[PDB]
Design a binder for this molecule. Structure first.
Ligand SMILES: Cc1cc(Nc2cc(CN3CCN(C)CC3)cc(NC(=O)c3cccc(Nc4ccnc5ccccc45)c3)c2)nc(N)n1
Length: 543
DNA sequence: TGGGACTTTTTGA
DNA sequence: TTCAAAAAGTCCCA
């Protein structure tokens, strides 16, 4: 059930400036009405609009048709259209619409109980409103997904969400100069699946307003990040997008009776984006952040991808059969050549890695099963059946006791920089202990030809700085509230500089490392050091 | 007695 | 062959 305030805002956004005198026959469609939250409000708005200009319509058009008593019949005959797949909800909505007036004379309501994505729509619509469903993967049928791939190939790929196709439908059946307004999951704004959908939206319609609630709990007891999209097919030359980006994600939607008061408040920020200048990922930042990002990009002559080699952690396929507590007795059964240090995301802090509390049995170095039979029978064999259900074990590529994705031994066993893949801040650490990690920690190492130009200490010094934290978070992908995705595709794009401040930055980073490593804690001074380093970085970037 | 955050491994390429 | 992205269900406490 969509919140009433958002429904009212969407309906008013679509219908407020409709010239009922010029076009007293508007077609407003809900594609996922369900109980009919949007359609009842549309009915109320239309009834008020018709009654306000009833005598003007009576004078302009047929005098006998336009009467106050006939408004209900006219709205139900020519104006309101709803579609859904639940017949009980359709009947409830039809009863609610009939009870709005209180057959007597051929009362007909244009409500359809059908698959909206498969219906052959006989005519397009002036206005479209609503909230497409959020049910995918588990709910879809094998035959249904194949039909989606064939029919909606321009927005639907692999395991993409269903509502993508709904966008494809809403644009297609929107009359020229019409208005559409929906509330959907926000994930398509920056996910790789939505690239085709975003291109389709950009090239087919004009986006007017984007309200981005980020991780705010819009829907009660549902963990979906929602956003409101308003678009039109009007012949416009400028096509600038208003963006209302939320600031406080911990708000509840009761601050005012109207969403406009919330948007106009300090809990939201507003900025304009030129649609023609949109990239393929829809960064959607304001002017100050854009200037900051542009200056940093211009100042830096190198990037992480240019000078570093990145990789993903070990994927064992069954962690319980290979990861043990470093104090476990069964580790006496394993030769120390097979044991490697193992860390988690929580082990990663700024500039350093916590001491490994776990050991990984690098079983790929076990050649035959007869020599190390004790390890296989008494440690790894406890999950052997599960290990045999892995894809590569079935295909015959991987032995049952081997790691499914053991990567390269030498990549991990070197000096390198590690970072968690999901964090609330930049946490890049130098690994001095040849630590191994799961896929929750990514790693990279400096290329040989860039070793003299760049050092690990300097890299972690600038990367953990507040400047680079803001710089990354500007374009970073947000998947949860206060949690960003630190993945190689976005991390390795980070640009880095090298100037006369290099030596002092590296020295401050080394001081921070030395303070962090020493057992007796005096960590407060690190903050002070950090501050100084940030200053230098700003002096380098002119910010 | 109800309500949200969390890391392992499955899978396309 | 192996990369890396993203899908995905179990749990507890005041
Ligand atoms: C926040 C919360 C959790 C909770 N239990 C709970 C907690 C935890 C984690 N803890 C442990 C203590 N800390 C060190 C960290 C937090 C784990 C579990 N079980 C688990 O079975 C568990 C443990 C680790 C990872 C995962 N797979 C997923 C992780 C993340 N995304 C996913 C999305 C879809 C599907 C699966 C996951 C499941 C259950 N109970 C209450 N009250 N609150």
């Amino acid at each position: 059930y969509t919140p009433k305030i958002i429904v009212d805002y969407i309906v008013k956004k679509t219908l407020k400036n409709h010239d009922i005198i010029k076009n007293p026959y508007p077609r407003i469609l809900d594609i996922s009405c369900g109980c009919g939250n949007f359609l009842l409000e549309v009915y109320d708005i239309l009834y008020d609009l018709f009654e306000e200009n009833i005598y003007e319509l009576k004078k302009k058009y047929d005098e006998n048709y336009w009467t106050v008593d006939n408004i209900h019949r006219h709205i139900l005959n020519y104006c309101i259209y709803g579609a859904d797949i639940d017949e009980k909800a359709i009947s409830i909505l039809k009863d609610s619409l009939t009870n709005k007036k209180v057959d007597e004379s051929d009362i007909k309501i244009n409500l359809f109980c059908c698959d909206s994505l498969k219906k052959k729509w006989r005519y397009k619509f002036d206005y479209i409103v609503g909230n497409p469903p959020y049910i995918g993967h588990k709910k879809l049928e094998k035959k249904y997904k194949k039909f989606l791939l064939e029919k909606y190939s321009e927005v639907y790929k692999d395991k993409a969400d269903l509502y993508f196709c709904f966008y494809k439908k809403i644009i297609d059946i929107l009359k020229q100069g019409g208005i559409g307004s929906v509330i959907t999951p926000r994930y398509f704004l920056e996910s790789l699946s939505g690239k085709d959908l975003r291109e389709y939206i950009k090239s087919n319609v004009n986006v007017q307003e984007i309200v981005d609630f980020l991780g705010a709990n819009i829907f009660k007891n549902i963990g979906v990040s929602s956003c409101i999209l308003t678009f039109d097919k009007k012949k416009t030359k400028e096509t600038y997008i208003d963006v209302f980006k939320i600031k406080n994600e911990d708000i509840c939607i009761n601050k005012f009776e109207t969403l406009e008061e919330l948007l106009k408040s300090s809990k939201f920020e507003h900025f304009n984006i030129n649609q023609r200048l949109l990239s393929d990922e829809w960064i959607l930042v304001n002017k100050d952040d854009e200037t900051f990002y542009n200056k940093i990009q211009e100042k830096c002559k190198y990037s992480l991808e240019d000078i570093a080699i990145s990789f993903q952690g070990i994927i064992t396929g069954c962690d319980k059969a290979f990861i043990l507590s470093k104090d476990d007795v069964k580790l006496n059964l394993v030769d120390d050549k097979f044991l490697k240090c193992w860390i988690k995301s929580k082990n990663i802090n700024k500039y350093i890695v916590d001491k490994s509390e776990y050991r990984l049995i690098y079983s790929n170095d076990i050649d035959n099963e007869n020599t190390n039979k004790r390890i296989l029978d008494e440690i790894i064999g406890l999950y052997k059946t599960k290990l045999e259900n892995r894809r590569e074990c079935k295909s015959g590529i991987r032995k049952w006791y081997e790691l499914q994705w053991g990567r390269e031994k030498l990549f991990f066993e070197r000096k390198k920089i590690m970072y968690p893949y999901k964090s609330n801040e930049n946490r890049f650490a130098i690994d001095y202990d040849n630590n191994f990690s799961s896929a929750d920690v990514y790693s990279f190492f400096i290329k040989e030809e860039y070793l003299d130009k760049f050092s690990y200490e300097y890299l972690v010094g600038i990367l953990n700085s507040s400047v680079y934290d803001k710089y990354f978070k500007i374009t970073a992908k947000k998947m949860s509230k206060n949690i960003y995705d630190y993945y190689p595709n976005k991390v390795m794009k980070i640009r880095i500089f090298r100037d006369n401040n290099y030596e002092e930055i590296e020295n401050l980073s080394k001081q921070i490392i030395s303070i962090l490593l020493n057992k007796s804690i005096d960590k407060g001074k690190v903050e002070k050091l950090q501050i100084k380093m940030d200053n230098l970085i700003m002096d380098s970037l002119g910010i």
